[PDB]
Amino acid sequence: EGKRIAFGFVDRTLPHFSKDDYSPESKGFVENSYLRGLTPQEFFFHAMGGREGLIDTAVKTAETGYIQRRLVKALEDIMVHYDNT
Amino acid sequence: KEKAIPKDQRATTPYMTKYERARILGTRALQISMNAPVFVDLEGETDPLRIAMKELAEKKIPLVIRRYLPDGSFEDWSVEELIVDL
């Protein structure tokens, strides 16, 4: 949602950390690569990041469909005539 | 007959649209496929659409297009006098 991984628990992000931790590795930073391999915590944070986009597609398909139908129904009867109007 | 515009006061484009071209080709192909006389020198063709294109090339299709103005009047243009882009 445009911000780093917020505190889901109270004053931390995962049971393996300590209260009031603001280090990058504790707030969703992946310093590894796909060739090296992901450690469990950054794997979890990456999973949430992907889930966001999955949801985005799955619902806004339908919303955009409704908007498209309303637009086409509104304008369907407009035609260039021989007067050029 | 009040709607018809005199030939001198015709204010529409002297080129023929793609829609008019497609309609004319379809009508002529149907009429040829229903055994109508052919006005050109057929040379080894057996497809009505191609003979329609051939007749269009020499400007020999004997049809007239009536164009409807929004008020209700109309404008008559012969297929012979319509410029077709190539």
What DSSP letter does each residue of A6-50 carry, written as one string? --SSSS-SSTTS-SS---GGGSS---S-TTT---HHHHHHHHHHH
* B12 chain-A contacts, CB cut-off 8 A: 82
Q: List, in order, residues 6 or more apart from B56 with CB less than 8 Å away.
A: B24, B25, B28, B79, B84
Contact A81 B70 (CB under 8 A): yes
Entry resolution (Å): 3.3
Contact A81 B12 (CB under 8 A): no
* A83 chain-B contacts, CB cut-off 8 A: 69-70
Contact A83 B75 (CB under 8 A): no
- d(CA B78, CA B67) in angstroms, rounded, equals 11
State the DSSP H helix or E strand holding residue A56, giving kind and residue range, or none if neither.
helix A40-75
Residue of A nearest to B75 (CA): A82
Q: Delineate the domains of chain B, giving CATH numbers in brackets.
A: 1-86 (3.90.940.10)
What DSSP letter does each residue of B37-50 carry, written as one string? ---S---S---HHH
- Exposed/middle/buried for B15, CB within 10 Å: 0-12, 13-18, 19+? exposed
Residue of A nearest to B14 (CA): A82
* B75 chain-A contacts, CB cut-off 8 A: 82
- d(CA A69, CA A74) in angstroms, rounded, equals 9
* B67 chain-A contacts, CB cut-off 8 A: 82
